[PDB]
């Protein structure tokens, strides 16, 4: 359908002893396919999806080299940032980076991104044009000038519109059986009496993929927002996702309420009622 490939990197400094904790993960859509953890035994980029396992030794050598090198870039960064912000050597700090590309339903490039954060706040980000930088503050402005002189954006643009898209298409083909399969939500409603006068209706969506979904309540055919609760979409732990929406209603008036479920796996939205 429409698709994306993203990589996420986190480094956390350890002032008491040793080097930062480093964790990298790669995704195609909502499927994790690779990982690296500096605390793990292998010290290699590891597979996490059956369809990536077919890649040969030069793939795993190259990805391991790149991911370990990235960890050292972050190690240097943490020292430099402590200096930019005039901070002590005694505290723990965090660097985060995410980059990737989206393609359309025709598998052609739609957009690319590369974003960087220090201690959980925006630091520097590549603009949608893939040519310019957004620097949050004066420290990041210093970094911007350095990255301009090092031709960083040029390289990233080339990757995001080229390699990124090309390998995403490759993965989509190799992992067709699951990556190009949509799992429609299995839906049902439960009823929970609160008193003689009131009850909670809860609308369930289970075992769905991809994660994107919309749940809405209506009363007599109009959207209702009062007395509703909507939980964050959550992983089931088997590759799929779950979500629910609930509403409090006068006991005996349950038939007025309808739950509406929208998902890429559904040709038209579903309507549920008690």
């Amino acid at each position: 359908g429409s698709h994306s490939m993203r990589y996420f990197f986190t480094s956390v400094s350890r002032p008491g002893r040793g080097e930062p904790r480093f964790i990298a993960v790669g995704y195609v859509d909502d499927t994790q396919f690779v990982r690296f953890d500096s605390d793990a035994a292998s010290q290699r980029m590891e597979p996490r999806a059956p369809w990536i396992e077919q890649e040969g030794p030069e793939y795993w050598d190259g990805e391991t080299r790149k991911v370990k090198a990235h960890s050292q870039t972050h190690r240097v960064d943490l020292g430099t940032l402590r200096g930019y912000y005039n901070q002590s050597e005694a505290g723990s700090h965090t660097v985060q980076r995410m980059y990737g590309c989206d393609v359309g339903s025709d598998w052609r490039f739609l957009r690319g991104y590369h974003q960087y954060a220090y201690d959980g706040k925006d630091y520097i980000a590549l603009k949608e044009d893939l040519r310019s930088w957004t620097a949050a503050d004066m420290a990041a402005q210093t970094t911007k000038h350095k990255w301009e002189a090092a031709h960083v954006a040029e390289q990233l643009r080339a990757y995001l519109e080229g390699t990124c898209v090309e390998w995403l298409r490759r993965y989509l083909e190799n992992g067709k059986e699951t990556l190009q399969r949509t799992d429609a939500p299995k839906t049902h409603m439960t009823h929970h009496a609160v008193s003689d006068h009131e009850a909670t209706l809860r609308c369930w969506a289970l075992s769905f993929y991809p994660a994107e979904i919309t749940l809405t309540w209506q009363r007599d055919g109009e959207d209702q927002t009062q007395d509703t609760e909507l939980v964050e979409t959550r992983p089931a732990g088997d590759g799929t996702f779950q979500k629910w929406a609930a509403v409090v209603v006068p006991s005996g008036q349950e038939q007025r309420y309808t739950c509406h479920v929208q998902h890429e796996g559904l040709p038209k939205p579903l309507t549920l009622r008690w």
Partner: peptide, 9 residues
């Protein structure tokens, strides 16, 4: 497949 990120801040 990853990009190369060699330039520090």
């Amino acid at each position: 497949r990853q990009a190369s990120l060699s330039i520090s801040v």
